[model samples]
Target: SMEQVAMELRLTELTRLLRSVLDQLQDKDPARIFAQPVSLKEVPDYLDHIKHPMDFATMRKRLEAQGYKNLHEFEEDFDLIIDNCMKYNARDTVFYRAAVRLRDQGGVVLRQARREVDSIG
Candidate 1:
């Protein structure tokens, strides 16, 4: 079962890499807004505006729960976090600027992961 062992190793390495990416992303958040889901009570029309919402806390849970099938899926959610922010906030707002920075930093982190991991789709 050497092939199986190789897959296990890939998975282990990928998981570790993803956790680091997640941590880096969380660290990049200055407003602490992306750490958790937006409160529906605070933003009553948020769900109406954003059909798909994402956050670091949820990503962390998904990573721990093995909910993601591959790195691409993880990236989708990561992109969505920024996408949701940009979509929800005005262009001149600080939240939008934060999302732009996260998107820039996240693109680099994701590219790094893809470079290091060949097993990812």
Candidate 2:
């Protein structure tokens, strides 16, 4: 089916993009700061665990402790995944919505980080 073919292509593109980014991170200064591949694989699970609004803080803390730094970093990678997912499968509205939500969460995380910085001064 065309949809299945498109999905597979999207997954392939995403996998390649992620690998490239990881390679770049490996070579750059402060190398390999990102979470482990195992941790990355757990992202969808984290997303799922956030079913209730009240669960967010705890879930975020857990993810942060796992080397995410903050929600924004996680969201950035999530967005990257979703972007590639969409590039080859834009017909899937569900994936598009998920990406938008992740991006929004990223914005919130950035704002939170900035506020923390301000408080430190």
Candidate 3:
């Protein structure tokens, strides 16, 4: 029982850390391109090009649902968002650059969280 409680707390902390990263990404994206999912009507070819799409709002929902089993799963979805953005937009476009920035900056925060979590293990 004690171990289970400790594990729950560990997962809770990891969720909080992931949420903070999502917050920073939303704040950093001035265009709000990645804040929500793209409208299929607005970008008709979005689904065609990006087979799997992800966004901050969807990730927030998953976080609330406890859909993620670990930090790696969380990061995978996060990376999918960035990768999807890069895939749909031209390399020189603002959206692409924003994705790059989020990837690098968010990655640093993620790694820091991982190290802290590993310490507890």
Candidate 4:
């Protein structure tokens, strides 16, 4: 039944709906837009926190305590947890991904926050 529901309604659709709700709330309360800008240099810091297999095991254990019995269930629950965390926290998943990509490509100075047209100059 759960798999059938998932098949009928894609995860991306759920993600989009959550994002839309967040967007509307952010519009109503502009302060929600304030978030830390994660820089390329921060990837090492992020990795330092997340790199341990034990950390994942600990998370898996916690998920199991909440009734997530398998990796697939844990993964879906993890996605929702991460989405909610970012929705309320100072930074977002995109910021983290960009930092990791920059680090992988060899550390380079990322342009500080700039408007789209300013980036061209």
Candidate 5:
């Protein structure tokens, strides 16, 4: 009983240490040496804390202005596109072939129409 608890804590500590080394720090985990299972999401807010060359958070804010329920909708569309691409052997470089369906079948036409109409009015 006691031995099992101690081993579990040790394994957790080792995992946390390894994760931090790999730049996968978890903000929601308490510093109790034994990490609890985590769910939900957390994000870096401070410039000093975030390691990025660009204003990623603010860029997403512009997308937020266009009104979607949440970022998950964006993620779903993104996954769909990637999945479609993968199904047809499309890498980022060789995307045109895989992406033909985007213009013909997906909503790229509608998006373009909306874009033009939004500016004309």
Candidate 6:
């Protein structure tokens, strides 16, 4: 059951990595900024929605190593993941391709914010 063991390890690592990000965004305000689903920090459960081969481990490590200490950093990591990944094999649009789509949506907000200083009357 090595594959099972390996998967377990991967999931464990994933859980830990995201837990850090989630802790920082546990409150609604910080959470709201990341987009829905992921920004919602329901990522722990959302992990269940992926049906693809890439668990996105590489980027996760890099995100942590880079010491993601800001919302911008979080946005960048998700953007990188979305640009480089495709996580659905025909799942629901909301949770489908979520690894990319969810984070993709999350990044949109920060991207707009960074375009900061908009005064719309």
Report per-prediction Cα RMSD to one decimal. Answer: 2.4, 18.0, 1.9, 16.9, 21.3, 14.5
Q: On residues 30-89, what C-alpha lDDT tens digit does candidate 6 reach at each position?
A: 323223323225445444663322223444554556444444555555554444334423
The better candidate by TM-score, 5 or 6, is 6
List, residue by residue over 1-121, the lDDT tens digit for candidate 5: 9998976665555334323321221122123111221111432332343222222233234333543333344334434433534443435544434344332433443344335434542
Q: Could you give the candidate ranking by TM-score, starting with the highest?
A: 1, 3, 2, 6, 4, 5
Please, what are the lDDT tens digits per residue for candidate 3 over residues 1-121?
Answer: 9999988887787777767766766776777778888899898988889999999889999987766767789889889989998888899999999999888877777887678667765
lDDT of 1 by residue, 13-115 (tens): 6788888878977778877879899999999999999999999999999998767767799999998999999989999999999999888877777788777
Give the Cα lDDT of each candidate: 0.86, 0.42, 0.82, 0.35, 0.35, 0.44
Q: Count the backbone clashes (under 3 Å) in each candidate.
A: 0, 0, 0, 0, 0, 1
TM-score of each: 0.87, 0.31, 0.84, 0.23, 0.22, 0.28
- Candidate closest to the true structure, highest lDDT: 1
Q: Give the lowest summed-lDDT range of ten residues in model 2.
A: 29-38
Regions of candidate 3 where Cα sits further than 4 Å from its true position: 1-6
Instruction: Locate the minimum summed-lDDT window of 10 residues in model 1.
Output: 112-121
- What is the number of residue pairs that collide in model 6? 1
So what's the TM-score on candidate 4? 0.23
Candidate 4: global Cα-lDDT? Answer: 0.35
Candidate 2, position 105, lDDT: 49
Could you tell me how far off, in angstroms, the CA of residue 119 lies in candidate 5 after the best superposition? 34
Error of 2 at 95 (Å): 1.4
* Model 4 per-residue lDDT tens digits across residues 1-121: 9997864444444334333333332233223211222232744465344332212234434533443332244344334333433433345565344333323331111112112113432
